[PDB]
Amino acid sequence: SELDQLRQEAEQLKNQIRDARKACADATLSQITNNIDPVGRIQMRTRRTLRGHLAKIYAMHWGTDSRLLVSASQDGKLIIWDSYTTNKVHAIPLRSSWVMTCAYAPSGNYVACGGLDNICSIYNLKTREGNVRVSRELAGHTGYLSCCRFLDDNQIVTSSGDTTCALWDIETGQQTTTFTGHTGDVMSLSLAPDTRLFVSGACDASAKLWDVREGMCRQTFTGHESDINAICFFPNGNAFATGSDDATCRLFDLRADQELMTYSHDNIICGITSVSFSKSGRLLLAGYDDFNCNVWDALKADRAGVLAGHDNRVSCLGVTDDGMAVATGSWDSFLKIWN
Amino acid sequence: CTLSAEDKAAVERSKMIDRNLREDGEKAAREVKLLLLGAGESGKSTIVKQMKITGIVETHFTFKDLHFKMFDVGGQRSERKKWIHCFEGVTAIIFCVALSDYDLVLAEDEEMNRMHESMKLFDSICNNKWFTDTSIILFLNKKDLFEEKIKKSPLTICYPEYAGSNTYEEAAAYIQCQFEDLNKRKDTKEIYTHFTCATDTKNVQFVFDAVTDVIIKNNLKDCGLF
Amino acid sequence: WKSSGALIPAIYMLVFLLGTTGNGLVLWTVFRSSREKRRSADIFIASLAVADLTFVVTLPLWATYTYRDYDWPFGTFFCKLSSYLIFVNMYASVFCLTGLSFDRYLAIVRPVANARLRLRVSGAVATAVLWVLAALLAMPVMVLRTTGDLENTTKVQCYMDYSMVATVSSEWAWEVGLGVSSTTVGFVVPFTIMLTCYFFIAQTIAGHFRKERIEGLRKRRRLLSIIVVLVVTFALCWMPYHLVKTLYMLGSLLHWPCDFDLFLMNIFPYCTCISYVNSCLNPFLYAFFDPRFRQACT
Amino acid sequence: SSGALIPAIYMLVFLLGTTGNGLVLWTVFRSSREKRRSADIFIASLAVADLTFVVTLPLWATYTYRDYDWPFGTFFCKLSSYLIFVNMYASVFCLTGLSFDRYLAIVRPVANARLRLRVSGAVATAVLWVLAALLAMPVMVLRTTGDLENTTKVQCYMDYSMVATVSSEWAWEVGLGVSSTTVGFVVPFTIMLTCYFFIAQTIAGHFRKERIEGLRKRRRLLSIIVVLVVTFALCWMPYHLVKTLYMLGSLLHWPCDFDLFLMNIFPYCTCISYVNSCLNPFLYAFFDPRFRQACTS
Amino acid sequence: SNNTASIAQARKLVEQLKMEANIDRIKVSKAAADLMAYCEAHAKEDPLLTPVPASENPFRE
Amino acid sequence: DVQLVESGGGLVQPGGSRKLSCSASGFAFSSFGMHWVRQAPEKGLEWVAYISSGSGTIYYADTVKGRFTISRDDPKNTLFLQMTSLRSEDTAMYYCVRSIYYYGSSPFDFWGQGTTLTVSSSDIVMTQATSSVPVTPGESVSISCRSSKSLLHSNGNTYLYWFLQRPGQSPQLLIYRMSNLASGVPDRFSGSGSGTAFTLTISRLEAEDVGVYYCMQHLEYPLTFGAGTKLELK
Ligand SMILES: COc1cccc(OC)c1-n1c(NS(=O)(=O)[C@@H](C)[C@H](O)c2ncc(C)cn2)nnc1-c1cccc(C)n1
Ligand SMILES: COc1cccc(OC)c1-n1c(NS(=O)(=O)[C@@H](C)[C@H](O)c2ncc(C)cn2)nnc1-c1cccc(C)n1
């Protein structure tokens, strides 16, 4: 029929695309990086362990100055720590206990948190009275919230749970532009340093590249066996790492739209939760539910030291902007700061 | 001892915040939590109505010096595999199944009967890997239609193997056994199988008896004797 | 006068073997899977096992002591250390039992009403305070026991020497005082706490399960039986010892004529021996009854 | 002045060994099984052998401070002599086995892999302990106490009256001494020298080529092997030297001044013997990760 | 209805693939060289590979 | 609004006692810690008492160590101060303030409206050398302040708060730690200091800048205010 022939054109185009992707690759990245040496064997010890939560921990985002951080937990509490002295600057009681994401504005005034309630709550921090208030309540998603990030004090990008990712304006709760291309729920997203493009990772084993102004998906990448649970960017805005549940991690390049080194081990059998880079993009720290945190080498697929101090699984991790710390949060209520 | 004035004030704020946080946690710790997996848009709603007298909707009732919190996840329309791990410490799972649900059209497939997908959803949670210790209660709801409908059509339409003669008691026993057999870990958890109705306000009391039993037996195992 | 001094060491050695192995098994079992279990009341079973083991480890010395008609050629340090071990371990055993009693009560009598009270008594700091009271309660026998010769018959004997403290007038007073001070906080206060806690436990466990169920009576019987057997075994084990001790050190003032006096001294070695019933059996009642321990053995 | 000098050293080494070896036994025991490896399976036996070696010291210290009068009975001195000897043998053997496994761990598998699994390595160490225990039985059997010449002093010694033939009083003594010393040191010392020399040759050969940073770590590595072999030599060699010299005193028939020398310095070599055990906590805690990265690389 | 519906999904899906295939694509060697170049150029600044003296780490001292 | 108001006053002969009360309106009184400052007829300020959040630490000044007592009532939103034996050197306004202390926090934001009291008839001294200035409108002018001890600390931040007070009002907070700037204050003023010599420079002179200018320190606890520096329009 007209539909049958449309699927035929679709499969023809699917093959035609793979033509060029193969036609571009000349030699593997692991073939070029034979020359450089091992990076070392990095062992870094825990410096501060801070304990105030009474449940699991599901999110953690560092500030814009590498001194303040915010942690979300199952009981309705969203603390705002101070990493140097390990005090507690603030403590926010929530409206719904069930939470799955936090976020810290790049200026320093706002903080966001949203979970299974389907709503995203923006919290004002510097007010005349002296208590933290709820400024807006953003509604419009039909599912749960996976990850929300800030562009400035007035715009925010939220990765839903049905199929969508939307861009908001804060003063008027209405949403401006909605990105609808996926086939399964979205789990994580990372923003580019230029702040014009962003990526998202679904549960149909895919990652896409969007355009924050135009509203179309320019590139789509494949090459996994199961869902993707984390995505980060290279400090240079040209490559992004992707975690998964098939125990592997992978590095993709936007200018080529190929795949690259596959940081897999034969002993690992479990999936991963979070993924980040370091300054200059030489290391790729990952978190595993085998109660571990492994450190790969972004240039040669070889492993380096590992970080093990946790009783239960690791849920989120992140590095700073000065590069002097990495923090990891577990289902055991504790949260640790590494060096 | 090298701290300044503002540092001492800063740590005083932290000590007070921590104390307040611990108190609130203790307050919330002594309050039983429940989960309500409907497994069908028809049966569930009545029970929450009788007990009271977007996404998650939570209800809060009291009975005989014990505070309850119920969570419902009816409308989510998402893969359950991703968010089900949030409910690990719940004391019980209230489950609802209809009786008139047999000989229904299913509105989508017209090849499968409703009670079969009910059984599949039952298995999925009774044998899940997080819910091994957590108990279950079955509130088989719409009997008022069952007594009327049993005589017109037998239970053989929805079941190949025989259910005996067609009388309310035998059919109720058979539908109950089909579910009760489904648990594999027969030594860890238990099922409580009430035959509820649309009246008489005993349905709130059955839950109190059940949850009391589960708390006391769990403590008995936690300390020695059992 | 006695007639069967040659039979006293036999039961001693039998108790030695039985206690050593019976508690080695449970100690190995608890050390083997303590990290996977993380039970709320395993720390008390551990302390009980260690207390029992040390209670019985220093026994063959007194065994081979009674054999050769009271000579004891093991020095001055070792009768001090042995006596101290024996007494500390006795007190520690009783205290651990009463602590397990109170914990079971705070767990069962209120399931979630005042679970907050657990974070102060179920902690290891409670075990610390138990042991610290234990050692200081027995320090007197460490300071006042010094081996020596007497009767001028080329035999040495480890007795308690009160010439250090009591004057020529207070030898009996100091003795009776320390003995009563031992038995009171050793038996009566712990037994009272145990009895009251277990009574309230029985009241709840019997009033709740009272409603007629098909299988309710079956579990009811098992629970009530285990509670009764626990209380009666503690009573029957540790009662004759303190009975005879207070009876002697009290009736000294009444000057019992002959036969009672001859009988008390005749029957004390058996009383000491029968006190080990709880040591030999606590493996079974407190570990083998736990089905997790049985699964570990199988 | 030795009678007043020696017990001080005994008590000092007691406190040091107890606290140290206790720390390492604690850190290896408190650790979970999944972090334990083969090297751990050996260092554990080393640590327990050291602790049991040092624990029986005060009973000896008081015996000297009392001018050699042993009051603790006939059993305790049998048990204590037995413990001290068997722990000596177990220590030397655990160190030797650790050396053998260390050499096996680096370059053996590429040549050939023929050995019993580590899961059976526990049974291996069991063989070690059992052969150790049976090797020192005569010291448990011929160590009866008693009173010598009519001074009140009771000191418990070697009584060679199981042979009970005057013509044969010296023969069994010298035989037992030489058997002890050979099976205790001549074998483990040579084999340790070989398995360490192979480490030397392989660190020389695997890294002949020039590298920017590997040579300095090679230097800090090759320091460790030499300090370790020499410290074991100084820790356990002298005692056997004087033992051997005394026992061979039969053949050469030295003058009495030489015998006085041997006797006067015998307590000092026994006192200095412990230095291996005493240093094991620190000399393990400092050099653990270096050995481990050397093994992995 | 459903037939008129499914064709809409079909055309909108197939449409993007032309915008996908109409993209210029450089060789992979250049991409790898660029990544390695950035890492080697900024290797000096990162305080996680090459530590800094304990005066500079605010956490440690 | 953050409105704060004080009450009590009148004349009391020596030895008598009175009591002062302050009521707060809508700023979450429980979290903030309050102070009490003073002002003689024509003189500088000084610091009289303190009370924290939670009624924990209590601190007093030297002159009033034994006569005065301070207290707070968490519900009902009021602050009290009771003076028992009154001497003749306490005729002054009494000016409540507020203060919240955390990482980025700005102490001494709000200031009361004051009362009056007429009776009958080590420390870090800070200088502010100049007394008055002939300042003319439209031109930049600067003010100096100094100290005895270096106010810098090992943490990394100094402690020098500048204030401003127009004739017939209550003080305002301008720049809290040197080089910061308080909310709602125009961008003209500047911190610009280091060590133990601090200054303040304004770009243009509007008419409102007339008044007195004070400098406070906050390292050690007996808190010393400087004298005044007056800006005369001409
Ligand atoms: C503790 O060392 C001993 C060593 C050897 C024999 C002993 O048998 C009493 C004990 N012994 C002791 N001595 S005693 O009190 O001084 C006793 C000799 C005293 O003269 C006395 N009392 C009562 C009467 C009627 C008469 N005369 N008290 N308890 C124990 C003990 C021993 C083992 C286990 C346990 C639980 N207890
Ligand atoms: C075992 O008890 C002792 C107690 C106190 C001091 C001792 O000094 C060595 C030992 N001792 C012993 N005595 S001995 O053999 O009877 C000795 C009397 C023998 O006659 C002899 N030997 C050598 C010469 C030249 C002459 N005469 N043998 N080994 C140890 C020992 C102890 C600790 C650690 C080690 C490794 N070894």
- Which residue's CA is the nearest one to ligand 1's atom 20? C159
Closest approach of C197 to chain D, Cα-based (Å) = 35
Query: Min CA distance, A235 vs chain E (Å)?
Result: 9
Give me the resolution in angstroms, 1 decimal: 3.6
Nearest to E39 among A20, A299, A322 (CB): A299
Strands F229-231 and F132-133: parallel
List own/partner pairs for C104-109 with CB under 8 A and 24 or more apart: C104/B223, C104/B224, C104/B225, C104/C41, C104/C197, C104/C201, C105/C197, C105/C198, C105/C200, C105/C201, C107/B219, C107/B222, C107/B223, C107/C40, C108/B216, C108/B219, C108/B220, C108/B223, C108/C201, C108/C204, C108/C205, C109/C200, C109/C201, C109/C204
Tokens of A171: 């003063």
CB neighbours of C24 closer than 8 A, spacing ≥ 6?
C53
For the annotated binding site of B for GTP, the residues are 41-46, 72-76, 141-144, 198
The 3-state secondary structure of D19-73 reads HHHHHHHHHHHHCCHHHCCHHHHHHHHHHHHHHHHHHCCHHHHHHHHCCCCCCCC
CA C241–ligand 1 middle distance (angstroms): 9
Q: What is the D148 CA–ligand 2 centroid distance (Å)? A: 18
Do E25 and A326 lie within an 8 Å CB cutoff? Answer: no
Q: Which residue of B has its CA nearest to C226?
A: B225
For residue D266, the ligand 2 atom closest to its alpha carbon is: 25
Asked whether B and D share 3 or more beta-carbon pairs under 8 angstroms, the answer is no
Closest-CA residue in chain E for A85?
E59
Among A181, A255, A337, the residue with its CB nearest the CB of E31 is A255
Chains F and C contact (Cβ–Cβ under 8 Å for 3 or more pairs): no
CB < 8 Å from E in window 234-263 of A? 234-236, 238-239, 253, 255-258, 260
- Ligand with an atom nearest the CA of residue C94: 1
Q: CA torsion sign, E43 to E46 to E48 to E54?
A: positive
Angle at D101 between CA D96 and CA D102, to 5 degrees: 95
Option in C35, C73, C77 nearest D32 (CB)? C35
Give the chain B residue nearest A142 (alpha carbons): B54
- Domains of chain B by residue range: 1-30, 32-216
Nearest to D234 by CA among D265, D273, D266: D273
Identify the residue whose C-alpha is closest to ligand 2 atom 36: D88
Contact across the interface for F31 and A128, Cβ inside 8 Å = no
CB contact under 8 A, B78 and A118: no
Cα–Cα dist C57/C276, whole Å: 12
Q: Are F211 and F166 in contact (CB under 8 A)?
A: yes
Query: What CATH class is the domain A2-338?
Result: mainly beta
Question: Is B46 strand, coil or helix?
Answer: helix
Lookup: tokens for B217: 């037996």
d(CA F211, CA F198): 19
By what technique were these coordinates determined?
Answer: cryo-EM
- Asked if residue D173 lies in contact with residue D248, where contact means CB atoms within 8 angstroms, the answer is no
Single out the residue of A40, A58, A42, A55 nearest to residue A328, CA to CA. A58
Range B32-216: architecture per CATH: 3-Layer(aba) Sandwich (3.40)
Select the residue from A11, A32, A210 to test the E interface by mutation, using most E Cβ atoms within 10 A: A32
* Beta carbon of D246 within 6 Å of any ligand 2 atom: yes
State how far the Cα of C10 lies from the Cα of C8, in Å rounded to an integer.
Answer: 6
Structure tokens belonging to residue D96: 């030797």
DSSP state of A125: -
Per CB-CB distance under 8 Å, the chain C contacts of B29 are 112, 115-116
What tokens does D122 get? 């526990």
Judged by CB atoms closer than 8 Å, whether chains meet at A130 and F26 is answered as no
Strand, helix or coil for residue F127: coil
Answer yes or no: are the C-beta atoms of C45 and C103 closer than 8 Å. Answer: no
Cβ-Cβ contacts under 8 Å for B82 (sequence gap 6 or more)? A185, A187, A203
With CB atoms and an 8 Å threshold, state whether A118 touches B54: yes
Judged by CB atoms closer than 8 Å, whether chains meet at F101 and B4 is answered as: no
| Cβ contact C104:B225 at 8 Å | yes
Q: Does E54 touch chain A (CB under 8 A)?
A: no
How many C-beta atoms lie closer than 10 Å to residue D191's C-beta? 15
Q: Find, among E40, F219, D239, the residue nearest to A36 by Cα.
A: E40
Count of CB pairs separated by less than 8 Å, A with E: 146
Three-class SS string for D194-250? HHHHHHHHHHHHHCCCCCCCHHHHHHHHHHHHHHHHHHHHHHHHHHHHHHHHHHHHH
Please check whether residue A91 is in contact with residue A79, taking contact to mean a CB–CB distance below 8 angstroms: yes
Query: What are chain D's domains?
Result: 2-296 (1.20.1070.10)
Q: What distance in Å separates the CA atoms of residue A235 and residue A192, rounded to the nearest whole number? A: 9
CA of C280 to the centre of ligand 1 (A): 19
Crossing angle (nearest 10°) for helices D288-296 and D214-252? 110
From the number of C-beta atoms within 10 Å of its C-beta (0-12, 13-18, 19+), residue F76 rates as: exposed
Which chain C residues are closer than 8 Å to B220 by Cβ? 108, 223
Ligand 2 binding pocket mutation candidate from D60, D79, D84, D87 (most atoms within 8 A of CB): D84
Among A14, A220, A280, the residue with its CB nearest the CB of E42 is: A280
Report whether residue C86 contacts ligand 1, using a CB cutoff of 6 Å.
Answer: yes
